[PDB]
Structure formats: structure tokens, C-alpha cells
Amino acid sequence: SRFENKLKTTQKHQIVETIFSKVKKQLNSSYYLPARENEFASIYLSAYSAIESDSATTIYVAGTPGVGKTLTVREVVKELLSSDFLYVEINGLKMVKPTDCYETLWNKVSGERLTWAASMESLEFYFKRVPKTIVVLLDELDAMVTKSQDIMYNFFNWTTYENAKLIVIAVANTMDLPERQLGNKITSRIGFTRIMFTGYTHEELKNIIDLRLKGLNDSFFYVDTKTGNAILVRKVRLRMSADAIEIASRKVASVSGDARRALKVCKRAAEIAEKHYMAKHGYGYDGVQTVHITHVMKALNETLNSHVITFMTRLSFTAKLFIYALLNLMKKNGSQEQELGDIVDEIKLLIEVNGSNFVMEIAKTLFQQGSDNISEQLRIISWDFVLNQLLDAGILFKQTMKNDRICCVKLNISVEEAKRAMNE
Amino acid sequence: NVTTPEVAFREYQTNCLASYISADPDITPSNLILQGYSGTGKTYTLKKYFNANPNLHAVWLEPVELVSWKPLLQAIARTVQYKLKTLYPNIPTTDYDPLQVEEPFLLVKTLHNIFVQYESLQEKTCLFLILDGFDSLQDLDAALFNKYIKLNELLPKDSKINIKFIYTMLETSFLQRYSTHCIPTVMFPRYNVDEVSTILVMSRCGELMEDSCLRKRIIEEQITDCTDDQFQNVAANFIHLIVQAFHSYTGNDIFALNDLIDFKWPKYVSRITKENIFEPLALYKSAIKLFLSTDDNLSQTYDLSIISKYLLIASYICSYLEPRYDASIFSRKNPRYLQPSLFAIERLLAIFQAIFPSLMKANIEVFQNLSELHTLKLIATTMNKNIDYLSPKVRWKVNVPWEIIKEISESVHFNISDYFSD
Amino acid sequence: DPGFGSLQRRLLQQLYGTLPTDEKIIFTYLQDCQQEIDRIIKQSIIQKESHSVILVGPRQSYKTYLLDYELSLLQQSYKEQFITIRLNGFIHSEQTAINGIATQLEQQLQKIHTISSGSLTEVFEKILLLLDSITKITVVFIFDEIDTFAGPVRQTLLYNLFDMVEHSRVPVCIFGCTTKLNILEYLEKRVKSRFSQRVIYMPQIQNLDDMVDAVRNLLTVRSEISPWVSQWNETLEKELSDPRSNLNRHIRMNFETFRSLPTLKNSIIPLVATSKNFGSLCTAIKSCSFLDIYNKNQLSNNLTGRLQSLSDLELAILISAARVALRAKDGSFNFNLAYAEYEKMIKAINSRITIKLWLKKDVKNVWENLVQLDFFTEKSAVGLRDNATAAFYASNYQFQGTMIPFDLRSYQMQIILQELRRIIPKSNMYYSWTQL
Amino acid sequence: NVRMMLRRSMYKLYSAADAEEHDVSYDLSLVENFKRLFGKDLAMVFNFKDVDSINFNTLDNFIILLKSAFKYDHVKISLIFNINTNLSNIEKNLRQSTIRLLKRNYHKLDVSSNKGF
Amino acid sequence: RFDLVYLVLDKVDEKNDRELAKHLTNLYLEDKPEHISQDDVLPVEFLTMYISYAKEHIHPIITEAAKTELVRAYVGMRKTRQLESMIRLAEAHAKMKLKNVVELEDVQEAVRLIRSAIKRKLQEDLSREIMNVLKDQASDSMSFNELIKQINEHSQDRVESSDIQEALSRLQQEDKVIVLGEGVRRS
Amino acid sequence: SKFSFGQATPRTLLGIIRLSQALAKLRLADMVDIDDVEEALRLVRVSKESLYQPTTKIFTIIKKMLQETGKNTLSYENIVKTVRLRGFTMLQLSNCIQEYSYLNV
Numbered sequence A: 001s002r003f004e005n006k007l008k009t010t011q012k013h014q015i016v017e018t019i020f021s022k023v024k025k026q027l028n029s030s031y032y033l034p035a036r037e038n039e040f041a042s043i044y045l046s047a048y049s050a051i052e053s054d055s056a057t058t059i060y061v062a063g064t065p066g067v068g069k070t071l072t073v074r075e076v077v078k079e080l081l082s083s084d085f086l087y088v089e090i091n092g093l094k095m096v097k098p099t100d101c102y103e104t105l106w107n108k109v110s111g112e113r114l115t116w117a118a119s120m121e122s123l124e125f126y127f128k129r130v131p132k133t134i135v136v137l138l139d140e141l142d143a144m145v146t147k148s149q150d151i152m153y154n155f156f157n158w159t160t161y162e163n164a165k166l167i168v169i170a171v172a173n174t175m176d177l178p179e180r181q182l183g184n185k186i187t188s189r190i191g192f193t194r195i196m197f198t199g200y201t202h203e204e205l206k207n208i209i210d211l212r213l214k215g216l217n218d219s220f221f222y223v224d225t226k227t228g229n230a231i232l233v234r235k236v237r238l239r240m241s242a243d244a245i246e247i248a249s250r251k252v253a254s255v256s257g258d259a260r261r262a263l264k265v266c267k268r269a270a271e272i273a274e275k276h277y278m279a280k281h282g283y284g285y286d287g288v289q290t291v292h293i294t295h296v297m298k299a300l301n302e303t304l305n306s307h308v309i310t311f312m313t314r315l316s317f318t319a320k321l322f323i324y325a326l327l328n329l330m331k332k333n334g335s336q337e338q339e340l341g342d343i344v345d346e347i348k349l350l351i352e353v354n355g356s357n358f359v360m361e362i363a364k365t366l367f368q369q370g371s372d373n374i375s376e377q378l379r380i381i382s383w384d385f386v387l388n389q390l391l392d393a394g395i396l397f398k399q400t401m402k403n404d405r406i407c408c409v410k411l412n413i414s415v416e417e418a419k420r421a422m423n424e
Numbered sequence B: 001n002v003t004t005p006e007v008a009f010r011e012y013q014t015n016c017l018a019s020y021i022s023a024d025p026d027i028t029p030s031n032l033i034l035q036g037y038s039g040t041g042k043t044y045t046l047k048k049y050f051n052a053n054p055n056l057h058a059v060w061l062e063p064v065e066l067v068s069w070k071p072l073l074q075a076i077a078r079t080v081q082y083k084l085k086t087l088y089p090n091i092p093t094t095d096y097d098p099l100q101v102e103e104p105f106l107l108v109k110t111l112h113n114i115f116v117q118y119e120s121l122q123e124k125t126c127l128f129l130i131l132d133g134f135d136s137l138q139d140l141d142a143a144l145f146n147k148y149i150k151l152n153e154l155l156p157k158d159s160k161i162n163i164k165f166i167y168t169m170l171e172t173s174f175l176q177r178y179s180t181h182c183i184p185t186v187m188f189p190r191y192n193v194d195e196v197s198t199i200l201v202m203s204r205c206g207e208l209m210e211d212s213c214l215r216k217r218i219i220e221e222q223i224t225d226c227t228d229d230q231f232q233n234v235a236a237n238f239i240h241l242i243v244q245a246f247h248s249y250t251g252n253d254i255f256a257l258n259d260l261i262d263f264k265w266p267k268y269v270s271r272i273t274k275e276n277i278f279e280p281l282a283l284y285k286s287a288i289k290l291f292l293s294t295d296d297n298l299s300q301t302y303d304l305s306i307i308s309k310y311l312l313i314a315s316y317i318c319s320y321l322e323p324r325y326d327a328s329i330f331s332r333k334n335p336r337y338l339q340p341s342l343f344a345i346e347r348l349l350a351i352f353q354a355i356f357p358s359l360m361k362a363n364i365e366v367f368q369n370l371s372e373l374h375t376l377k378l379i380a381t382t383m384n385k386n387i388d389y390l391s392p393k394v395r396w397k398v399n400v401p402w403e404i405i406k407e408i409s410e411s412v413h414f415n416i417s418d419y420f421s422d
Numbered sequence C: 001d002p003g004f005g006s007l008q009r010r011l012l013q014q015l016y017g018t019l020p021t022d023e024k025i026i027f028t029y030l031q032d033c034q035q036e037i038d039r040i041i042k043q044s045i046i047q048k049e050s051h052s053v054i055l056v057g058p059r060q061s062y063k064t065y066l067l068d069y070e071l072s073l074l075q076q077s078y079k080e081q082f083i084t085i086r087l088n089g090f091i092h093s094e095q096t097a098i099n100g101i102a103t104q105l106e107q108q109l110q111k112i113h114t115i116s117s118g119s120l121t122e123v124f125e126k127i128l129l130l131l132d133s134i135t136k137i138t139v140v141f142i143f144d145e146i147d148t149f150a151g152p153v154r155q156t157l158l159y160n161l162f163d164m165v166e167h168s169r170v171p172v173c174i175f176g177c178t179t180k181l182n183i184l185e186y187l188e189k190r191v192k193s194r195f196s197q198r199v200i201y202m203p204q205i206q207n208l209d210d211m212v213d214a215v216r217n218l219l220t221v222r223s224e225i226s227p228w229v230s231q232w233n234e235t236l237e238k239e240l241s242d243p244r245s246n247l248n249r250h251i252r253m254n255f256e257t258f259r260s261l262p263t264l265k266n267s268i269i270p271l272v273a274t275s276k277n278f279g280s281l282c283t284a285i286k287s288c289s290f291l292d293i294y295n296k297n298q299l300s301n302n303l304t305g306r307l308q309s310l311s312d313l314e315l316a317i318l319i320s321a322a323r324v325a326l327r328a329k330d331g332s333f334n335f336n337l338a339y340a341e342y343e344k345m346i347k348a349i350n351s352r353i354t355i356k357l358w359l360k361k362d363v364k365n366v367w368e369n370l371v372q373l374d375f376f377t378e379k380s381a382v383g384l385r386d387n388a389t390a391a392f393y394a395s396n397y398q399f400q401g402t403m404i405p406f407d408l409r410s411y412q413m414q415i416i417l418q419e420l421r422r423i424i425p426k427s428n429m430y431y432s433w434t435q436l
Numbered sequence D: 001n002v003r004m005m006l007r008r009s010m011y012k013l014y015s016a017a018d019a020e021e022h023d024v025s026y027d028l029s030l031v032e033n034f035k036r037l038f039g040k041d042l043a044m045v046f047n048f049k050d051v052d053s054i055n056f057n058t059l060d061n062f063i064i065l066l067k068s069a070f071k072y073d074h075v076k077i078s079l080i081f082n083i084n085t086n087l088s089n090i091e092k093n094l095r096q097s098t099i100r101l102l103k104r105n106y107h108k109l110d111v112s113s114n115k116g117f
Numbered sequence E: 001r002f003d004l005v006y007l008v009l010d011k012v013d014e015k016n017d018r019e020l021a022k023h024l025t026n027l028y029l030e031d032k033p034e035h036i037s038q039d040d041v042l043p044v045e046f047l048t049m050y051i052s053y054a055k056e057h058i059h060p061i062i063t064e065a066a067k068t069e070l071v072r073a074y075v076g077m078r079k080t081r082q083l084e085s086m087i088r089l090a091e092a093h094a095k096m097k098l099k100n101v102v103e104l105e106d107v108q109e110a111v112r113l114i115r116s117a118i119k120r121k122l123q124e125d126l127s128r129e130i131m132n133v134l135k136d137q138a139s140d141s142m143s144f145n146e147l148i149k150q151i152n153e154h155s156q157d158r159v160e161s162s163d164i165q166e167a168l169s170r171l172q173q174e175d176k177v178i179v180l181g182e183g184v185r186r187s
Numbered sequence F: 001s002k003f004s005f006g007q008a009t010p011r012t013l014l015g016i017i018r019l020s021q022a023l024a025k026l027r028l029a030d031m032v033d034i035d036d037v038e039e040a041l042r043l044v045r046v047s048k049e050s051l052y053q054p055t056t057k058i059f060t061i062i063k064k065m066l067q068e069t070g071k072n073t074l075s076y077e078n079i080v081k082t083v084r085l086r087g088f089t090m091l092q093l094s095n096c097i098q099e100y101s102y103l104n105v
């Protein structure tokens, strides 16, 4: 509103619009829908009746995140401005305290800043007195349910008044929410509309990608060979291999069916080809191009593959010495949770059960940093350090006790992969 | 480059603190740990550096005279604008409220407000903050010490004045929680038996030759014109013996030596002669009686009445007597070391009616002395100290050791050692 | 000469990295990781990208050192082009961090050329409307310990900034730095779907040769300042090229236990400031005997020098204190059980031969220091609470262990009996009592 | 606790200070600035009413906090220990490092309603 | 009384057995191993001549100078047959490398040798239970059946009745417990 | 377990090498190809199987096979029939079955 005038600055020194820059502009998550096409009507025809008849209803939709329920209801009200209402985005998680939404409503009727106490008095005074038109979105309803349900009873008791000019639209995480958190007295007021949103399917996940790739798929750019700048000296084209787009779809529809996850894995795979193109020619920052299948093979795996295995083999020696002692106790006792003094008891013992071999150059260093002057250390060198280093890494976990002997230690990652990474 | 001082036994540690501190901020490391137990003179050896370095500027804070972190932020912000007033008095100032801050954001909010008007200075000057006693803060936790580490980096790094820290703490189990931050530490070792005595002689000659208790005893006895060196010898003979007859009792302390001297000194003064000033060995043989006793304890026959005395003597019985054995051995027809068991009500009067000399039946005064004994904290409740009256589930227990029971048994002529049988 | 001291000026600020930003030196074992960070960060400002990332690696891993290095690398040429907002998860709670953002916003506006005024949720929708909405100012977020924001209960502040990726015309970039490795499972579903899923792991010194290559680039000065420099540079590598040299020998120890450079970087700072002439410094890195004294002092009072610095009685109490501790099943022991077996130990010494057996009223004064030397612990005593409100819940709680007297607080053991035999020399008379 | 034993006690003298005097923080900050906050110097006295019911480690940690006030020289401290009985019990409970702090100038005055009748 | 034992266990894993299969097929790479001479390997005829010269020309003495490292090498296995084996091991270490006097470093490796050459829950519970059903049997025998029954009776650590059979066999054969009858079980 | 017998030995590996040499000797070739080892391993696994009584192209081929019935069958007799006429062995496609199962196709 105000400060966007101050967020503008002047000197914009000719940023290089490369080949893959114009992809990510439309691969931004902003800018009729194919997948939830008919269900848009099922909201709207439920909404169009109450709007043009001055009533008060409730609409309940659910589903996993990434299915358009943030998007679709915005498209409902957007066309309605063409044809009497006040649009508010009452987000649940964007309220600091749960009562703070009450302030917004009384602010968004006349422009006053009053109590969550004093708001809901005048709100109740509004909802049963006004002679005769308010659209409210109650987003992310896991936030506003937590304390004692006294807030949630209000937001549907206002719907019961026949003289209440309000239209509520609830969007939750799960259909189960008025059956495993709310009471039945709320569950009578929630109704039984219950419009379910499923996931997306992999065919439609192809049909959502090309909507972003409408005017740019297999099109042509005008490029100077000196700076790498592209314009919608050569006239190059850039093509997108649809089969790699398909294998992006057949995974994301399989695991999650999330519309952000489908776009972003294409967005991550787009910039892999960006740096490899910049690697071969170096246009910096101041014949026919494509994106291979091998890009989305890596980037989809890049969502999965870890490093704690690679982290463990790149740790210190006494770190790998520590875990090897720790699995030795877990196969000695079978109790998966060993006392800290017994580990210090073991790393002493794991010196001399090996022979008089490298182990001696270890055993010299393991109790003194050379320096035969100062010696005879009880616990090993930096034993507080590696145990602190294994703690904040999340691999280990150690309960709090002022005794530094009988405080228990519990593993936090799978102990087999700890056994498996130890083998290297 | 800096002008190092010199002290008695910190010859390595004066070098590192001269190493890890410069007036230039870039060479100066951010955070620092001076660690050691109480009895090493770290507050001594730190200030002893600072008196030899008038070029730098030190702001001295004291956490032990505070109680919490919420005033501790108010302690910091009040003092830097107090100090920078006395360092650059030409610089004009919008003085802020140090009472206003209570949260760890508000400090760096206000230090963003403080330092910006001081930007016009000529060179990058550092400013050393000193916290003394960070472990004995009485509301400490895990997530306070790291909260003060990163305060430097939230500051703008390009300001003309840079605030850096030095932390004084003890109880080295605490430092082992934060070794992964790898801030530079200078540990301070404990002492040995000679250097305790060596520190103590060069610190207590300035009072024990100038005390009037000597100066009275100078003119009271036939004063030979004994030298200050002759006063120095008997002072040194005192110190070199008092640490010898007490070192096993006190450990390697300095504070616990600084007061035991000031208890046994005038009692040592009275037992000198005119002649034993030249005779030190026989002087110890005449003043022997204080050198084998502690004299730090400033055994009561207890005030309580007779029926309350038998009320105590029945309460000690259920430190070993279980309900499986007691009703057999106390018919009307070893855990001496161990922690006491838990009572209930009316088991007292079960044992009290038995062991009293039909001769008694009225129990109003017997009920009087119970909560009399509750105010003496000799028998206390297991639970909180509130609802113990109405018989809900309330368990009781003694808090008196065996010896005070043993004297109070014979004080009422009652025999107790028979009924304790391992 | 001051030229030797001028070399101390150069070498010290090289060991702290406080040079001007043109000559800050990054070690070779992470040069790839800063460039992919650079490819993230410089196309976010110049090419107006709106993408986030999470830095993940252990403590003291140059993570905050890398990011402001990029900013200083961009502060020289892109001055007004961007502003930075830096938040620590340590210094900011969940709710004051909203006031943390807005107050750090407005002070940038006077540097680039009514916001903090109102309630906490009043200013919250303000920065929502100021962010969601010639060229546009881009904003870089610097988040230290973003895992603590990722708690179980609310996770509000993460949810707003990650949606600012999706909708805002203002180009942003988010930089999470943490050390909890599996950060992605710590998030819930609805926040992770907002997240662009790209994390980058921080490298470690994977070979012994790597940090050897690092310390060479660390200590070597390349710019001409002192006459000593050309002499000083070849002395460094000659110690480093020899695998039998002591500096090369002691670096191998640092590769073994710590395998972390700023630990070793800490050791050199007194070693190069303790010299007073040029030739002494060259002998110091040739001898490296100061590193022995340094590792002596870092070790001198954790547990062993605690034990060596006690008198005859304090040993004798503790030696008895463990011989009681071996008997019970949990190992707990009272004060009366200590002094009883301490009595017969002294009686055994006189009967086998003149040692002052002390009283009851004095051992307490020795017993006081032993518990605050942490050689014992209380039986059920959670030492340090993690945060403030868990510690405040322990302060109001009246305790029962103080309500039993001093000589019956069931003290347990920190240092076990069998380990005492290995540290106590056989020359001491109580050596027969270490073993049972 | 240690905390509210400090905080209520600083509050209790502060209103007693303004009433004789004719915004601030309730901790030891007032104790040094009492020369400047109220002009004349300070000699406070501590009527510990029922001393044996208190957890003594709180009392022992309390008196170390009062030990830090000994470096301002315009304030004088005086402690009154109204025990019920059993002085030998009290030297058992405290830390021995603080008994040596206590034993400088102690006075064992007896106050009993029944004293030799 | 055996002088030297050898744990020649495989313990199969990666980056080991791969080199094993590669070295076994490397002489299958060529039809004839004529390329066996360009490596650090002595021939057989030179080896037996050096061995026959060393066995009949060197009488090494075990001096008192290697006393201190032997005592401590014995107590580590003690915390006389091992001592008699290690002195012959140390004199064979002295037999090689043309030495007439034994040296202090030569026993270090010898001990490493015998320490690298050699590098309970089940039966415990077993006996435990046996004891139990004994007790609850008025000491009468535990049945095969009831044994198996209580022993699989716990889901946690899966004692398979075959494994059961085996460990049982062990203890009995270890003489700890007695079991009789093909169709029955005795505690 | 219950249906197990023996373990893998190096003599079985030497016998597999000898059977591959015999298969190359029966084809009168001077070299051992990839077709003999995949036949010998199939032989030694089907010798015990009676008790129960280079990848992207293959994936593309599988997709082509699907472009008819849309069937995700576990074991194949008519998917492999379009592979042998091209040039790849029976072992490469055998890995393509298992790998890809990670694609859940």
C-alpha cells in the first residue's frame, strides 16, 4: 500500500535474461483450472444460491495441502466482484494468538480496533440485529481449534442466525476434523456437505504443467552469442522433453499428489541444466537447446537421497570409534539404551583387546596429544567434544542428568545403517 | 603489542590474556572463557591486568549481585551509555531508557540505537565487557549461555565501537556442554601446598604487622625494639605453620585460609612472651592448643517438655521398627545409619501409649506438642505443608540424627538401645 | 623491529579472517560449496530469483562466515541493490521475532533513503501487506538456528515467509542455517509443501591432506608487507612438507580427535603472539613445544588435575567414598556410611605400623568442596534445564532432599573406584585401598 | 526461592524509604545508589522470623548475595536470627564456607519467657 | 596347551570379496601367467635356500632386555603355555632377518600376532526359564513343550524352537541341564 | 531358514566360470560373451527352483508394451520377446525389472 512506493529503486543494470530465466518466470507459482474443474462449480453453485438470496450457510472442504483449495476459493470470489460482499482471508496460522482473528472481523466491518472480548460482543450484536453479505475464509483450521473449542463454537453459531449476513467457508486439513477434535454439538452445525478433494492424477499433472508452459514450450528466443541474453548472434529454440515431464508426474501423483511439489521439482530440474549450460560457455551474470531426461532423474532423487551415511564416514576417528563402541554394547546387552559410563568403560577396554599393533600410535594420541609430560587421562581426549558434536548433529540423543555416568543415551537414527556405515 | 603486568603464579596465563586481548578490535577474538574454580584469583588476575593497561577501557559487570537475566540485560545497557558518556563527552546523545529492555531482542534493538550516534569516531575502538561469575547465576539454564555468544554478530559489524565479551565461570562440567562452539578458553589451575603459602604470605603481611592487636601487645609487654623484620619473621613463622597444621582440613583454598587466620590470630597474640620473639619453636609449644582444634563451631539438651520428650522417643522407633514386628515385641500382655521410613498418624499413639510410665488417658496436650514439633522441623510432612491436618494421605518422618535421640533417651531415663536389634 | 611486529599484525588478522573482503581466503575443501551458494545468492538479487535453501552442517563450519562473505563480496558493487535481515533463533522467540523483523526493516529505509507502531499482530499484517504487494528492492533473509523455530506447536513464522516465495512480487531468498541433520522431517506437512526442498550439506575435511592444504593457505601471507615475509613463507612450508616435522606431526593429532580446523586455528594465536623477535617465532613453529603446554592447560582441570590438586584427607575421604559405593546395587551411599568405613581404614593403617584421625564436625567442611568439585552428585538431580520456563517450573518446587539433613542426602558417584587405581600412584600409602 | 526473597525485600524497604523521603528496579541497584537516591546512608536489619522452616540452601545462597554488597561502604548490614531453638541444628544445615562468614561477630543472646523463672 | 590358534572367519562384505573375485579372474584374463615376475615376490628356490641357511646357521639367544615387555604381555591374557609359545614366537622373530640377539620391538608384533589371531542372552534366558519351570514344577522337569511354549511366549527376541533345541542341546551337553526322551523335555 | 541349503562358495564361482567356458566351447568361440553367464546363473537357480512346486531404452520398450493393454505384470514371457531382436542380453533387462520397481510402475 504505502511503502511499495519506497520499495522501488532506480539503477537496474541490464540483467541477463538467459534461456532458462524466462522459464522460471512462468514457473513461478502465481501465473479456469483443469483438474478441479467441476468441483469449482460445486463450490460456486453452493455459493451462488446463498449470495443472491441473502442467507447464511456453511461450506466445508478438506484435503492434503497442495490441491488448490487455497487457490480455488480465491477463483470463486474473483469472478463474483463482477456481479455486495466483503472478502477477508482469516488465516489460522497467520494469527499470533487464536483470539486475534476476532479483532480483524470488527476491524473489517467499520474500521475499529477493539478487544477480542469487545469485538465479539459487537459481532454478536451485529449478527442478530441488522436488517437486510459477508464472505469469510477460515483457512488452516488446525491452528484455531487447539485450546478449548470456545472459539470454534462461535464461528458456526453465528451461521445459525437467520438475520446473519455472513457466508463462511471452512478449509481444513482433514475431513476427520469435526469428528476427532470437535464436539458433536459443533458437528451438527458443520453440516454434511463435506466436499472432498482428492489428490491430483498424473495425467492432469501433465495438464497443469503446460498451462505454465503455454506460450513458451518449443518456442524461439533471439540470442546474442556474447552475453547469453535471450529475447522472446543466433535465433535459438528451446524444447522440453515431455516424457521427462511425464516421469515427474508419475512420481508426485504417486506419493503426494501435491501441486507445489510437481511444479518445484520441475523448477529444481530446470536450474540443473542452467548451470551446466553456464559451465560449458560461461556467460556469467551481468544448435537447439533442450532439457534432458537425465535432469529430472537427478532432481527427483535429490528430494530423496541423504548424507548421514556420507557424514559418518567423513567424521572424526573418535566419532567412528564412539559409534562402534555403542553398537557393541547394544549387541552385548540387547537393551538399545546404554549408560554413559559403560561406554567410557568400553573404549578403555577396546584398546587392549586389540593387540600391540597403529593402535599404539592411536593409544598414545588417544589419551595425550603427544607430550609425555602431561598424561594419564581418565576419559579420552575431547570426549565431551565428540559427544557434544554427536548430540547437535541429531545422530545421538542424551537425556539430561547432572551425573555424567548414569545418564542414558538413546540412538536416534536406525542402528543398522549405523552398523552399515561403520563398515567403510 | 601490549604492556603486560607481572604476578606471582600466572606466568603462562598472563601471556595468553595479553595474547587474546588487544586494543585493536580485529586482532581481538570475540568471546572468551576464563575458567577455574573459586580459589584461583581470577578476579584478582584479571583486574591486575587492567590496572596495568590504562589504554583500554573496561566495563565491569557483576552477575552475582544480580538474580536474573531480565535485569542482566538492564545491567548491560545502563552501563555502556554510562561508560561512553565518560569516554566521549563531546558526543551528543538521545539517552534511552535502560528500564525499557526486558527481552533479548530489546538489547540489540537498543544497541542498534546506542552506537549509531557514536559513528563519527576516529578509529575502530574496542570495548571489553566483563561478566564475573556466570555459573552461579541463580536462574541459569542451557539456553542462556549460547544466547549471549551470538550477540556480537547481530550488531552491525562496521560500527566504530565494537563490543566484545569475557566470561568468568566455574564448575567445568558446565563448560563441557559448549566445547563445540570452540571459543578460546584459558583454564586456571588449582594450587599446590607451597604456592598457597607463598600467595598467602605476600598478601597478609600488610595487615598482620599493622594490626593494633600486635601494636597493643608491643607496648603491653616489655618492648624490645624489635624490627619490622622481626615482626615479619613471627608473621612468617605464623603463616608457614598455620598452613602446615591445617592444609588437610581446608584443601587448596585461599578464602578459607583468609578467615581462619583472622580467627586464630589474636588468640595466638596473647600467648606470646617478651622472650619468645627470639624463640619461635617453643612459642608454638606454648600456643599449641589452638593449632589442633578447628574453632569454627560457634550438642543441645533440648528445650521440649516431658510428654513431648516421649513423643520424640516414639517417633524415632519407626526408623527401623516395621509393622510386622512392633506389635509382638511391645505387647501389653542396621538402619541406625539408613534413611528414616515413613509414618502415618496414630501409629505414634500406638507406640506412645505403650511406652509411657492407664496412667495417662487425656491426649489434648499430646496433640499440642505434635505441631509444636512440626514448627521445630524435627518431624516434617512428606507432602507440601498445607493440608496435613485432616487425615488425607499424609506420611510423616523424623529429621533428627541418632545421637540427639540417644542423649534425650537418658535425659528422661528411658532405654532405647535394647529395642534396636540387627 | 616493528616490521616483525607488522608481520604480527598481518598474520593475526589472517588467522581471524578480518581482512578486507577482496583477500579473505577460503580453503580449498569447500570452494565448490561457496560457488553453488554464490550461484544461489547472486541470481536471487541480480536475476531477481525467489528461491530458498537450507544450510546444514555441524558447529564452527564457516556457515555464518560464508554468507556475510558473499554479502561483502556483493557490498562492494551492489550497494543499494539489496538489504539484509538477520535473525537468530537463539536470540528471538516465536513472537518477538515479528518485532525483530519490523524494527530491522525501518532502519534500512533511512540507509536506502510508522512500521513498528501498533500491536504485535497489527504490525504483523503490516509486513504481510508490505511484502506480498527502475527496479524492486530484493531482501535477503539470514536465519541462524532455524530448527528452533521448527517446534511442534505453532510454526507460524516459517509458514508466512515460505508463502512469500509463492505470491510476493518482492524478490526474496531465505537462508536457513542449522545443525540438526534431518531438518526436513522436523517440519510438518503444510510447511514442507511450501518449502522448495533444496538443502545443501556442508563439507568436512575428508582426507588428512586436506587440512594440511588448508593450513598452508591459512598461514601463508602473499602480500608484501615485511622484509621478513619471504624468509617467513619458506619456513612455514619446510615444516609442512616434512612428514616427520613436529608441526606436521601435531596437525595429524588434530585430524584424529577433532577433525575441525578452528580448534587448531585457536592454538596458533597464542603461539604467534608469544614471540618477541623474529628468530624466536621460527623456532617456535619448528619446536611446537608450546602446543604441548597449550594442550596441557586445556586439560589441566577437567577431571584429572581436579584429582591431583587435593590434599591427603580429601583423597582419603573420596577413596573411602567409592569403597562404600561398590557395595550397594545402585552405588548410592550416605555420609554416615562414608565416615564409618573411613574410620576403619585409618584404624587399619595404625594397626599395621601416627595419622591424625579427624572428627565428625570437620569432615563436613571437606565434604562441602567435594560435592562442588563434582566428584559426587545428588541421586536424582536434573542439573540444567534446557530453556527458561522449564527452569522456572523447577524454582517454585519446594524440595524434599533439603528437608532430610545434610548427612543423609544420598550422594552418588561421578568417578568410579576402579579408575582411581590407574591415576593414584603406588607411592601414596592409600594405593592398597584403590583396589578393594 | 532466592529470587522473590530478594525482590519482595527490596520492595519492602523502598516504600519505607519514600515515606521518610517526602520507576526504579527492585534489586541491589538501589543499594549502591541509595546515597544518591535518598541522600543519607543506610543501615538495614533483617528480622528472619521463623528461620528453621526455610530450606537453608536458599538461605545460604541468599547470604552470599548479601556478601556482594560489602564494597560500597555507605551501607551497614545487620542480621537477626529468630530461631525457635537448637543452635547446634543450625550449624549443621548451612554450608561451612558461610559459617566462617557468619562467625566474625556473633552474639548468642538468650530470649526466653521462661529463663530461671 | 595349543601354541597358536587362527580365526580364519570370512565375515563377507563389500570392497573385499570384490577384489577376491577380481584376483581370481585376473589370471583368467590371460591364458598363461608369464607376467607373474614383475612384482615384489621371491622365487621358491631362493626362498628355500635362505630358509635352510637361516635354520642351520642362527642360534639366537633370548636376552634379559626383553623381560619388561613380556611380563605385561602375559598379564593382559591373565587379567604358562602362552608364555612358552610366545618365547618360541619371539625367537622365531629373531630367527628371521639374520639376527643373533633378540630385540625389544620383535615381541611387540609377536603379541599383536596372538592378539589378532583370536581377535549368552540366549542360554541365559534359557537356564533362567528352566530354573523357573523347575521351581514352579516343585523342581520337577520342564517339558520340551512348555519350554518351547514359554520361550516363544515372548515376542521380543524370537527364540525359534529349533534354536531352542540347539541351545538346549548346548547346555545339556555343556552338562548344565539334563534332558531325556525323544518325545519329551526335561529341565 | 526352513527352505535354505548351503551357502555361496568360491568353488561354485569357479564352476560358473567353467560352465561359461563350456558354453563358449559349445558355440566354438574364442571368447566368452555375456550370454553364457546369464544362462549358467539361470541354470544353477532353476536347479533348486523346483522345490517350491542400458536401462532407459528398456524402460521405453516397457512403456511401448504398455501402450496396448496397460498391464503391470510381475514375470514376463512376451515383454522380453521384443528385446532380443534388438541387441541387448537377458541380464540387462533383468536389472530393468528390479530398478523400475522403484518407479512403482
Ligand SMILES: Nc1ncnc2c1ncn2[C@@H]1O[C@H](COP(=O)(O)OP(=O)(O)OP(O)(O)=S)[C@@H](O)[C@H]1O
Pocket: A029, A030, A033, A034, A035, A036, A064, A065, A066, A067, A068, A069, A070, A071, A072, A208, A211, A259, A260, C190, C193
Ligand atoms: N489446478 C491448478 N491450476 C493451476 N495452478 C494450480 C492448480 N492447483 C494448484 N496450483 C498452483 O499451486 C499452488 C498450490 O497451492 P494450493 O494447492 O492452492 O494450496 P493448498 O492446496 O491449500 O495447500 P495449503 O494451502 O498448504 S492447505 C497454487 O497456489 C497455484 O499457484
Ligand SMILES: Nc1ncnc2c1ncn2[C@@H]1O[C@H](COP(=O)(O)OP(=O)(O)OP(O)(O)=S)[C@@H](O)[C@H]1O
Pocket: B007, B008, B009, B010, B037, B038, B039, B040, B041, B042, B043, B044, B045, B199, B203, B254, B255
Ligand atoms: N598471584 C597472586 N598474587 C597475589 N594474590 C593472589 C594471586 N592469585 C590469587 N591471589 C589472591 O587470591 C584471592 C582470590 O580472589 P578471587 O578472584 O575471588 O578468587 P576466585 O578463585 O576468583 O574466586 P571467585 O571470586 O568466586 S571467581 C585474591 O583476592 C588475591 O588476593
Ligand SMILES: Nc1ncnc2c1ncn2[C@@H]1O[C@H](COP(=O)(O)OP(=O)(O)OP(O)(O)=S)[C@@H](O)[C@H]1O
Pocket: B157, C016, C017, C018, C058, C059, C060, C061, C062, C063, C064, C065, C066, C144, C145, C177, C262
Ligand atoms: N566477523 C567474522 N569475520 C570473519 N570470520 C568470522 C567472523 N565471525 C566468525 N567468523 C568465523 O566463523 C567460523 C565459525 O563458523 P560459524 O559459521 O561462524 O559458526 P557455525 O557454527 O559455523 O555457524 P553458527 O555461527 O554456529 S550459527 C570461525 O572460523 C570464525 O573465524
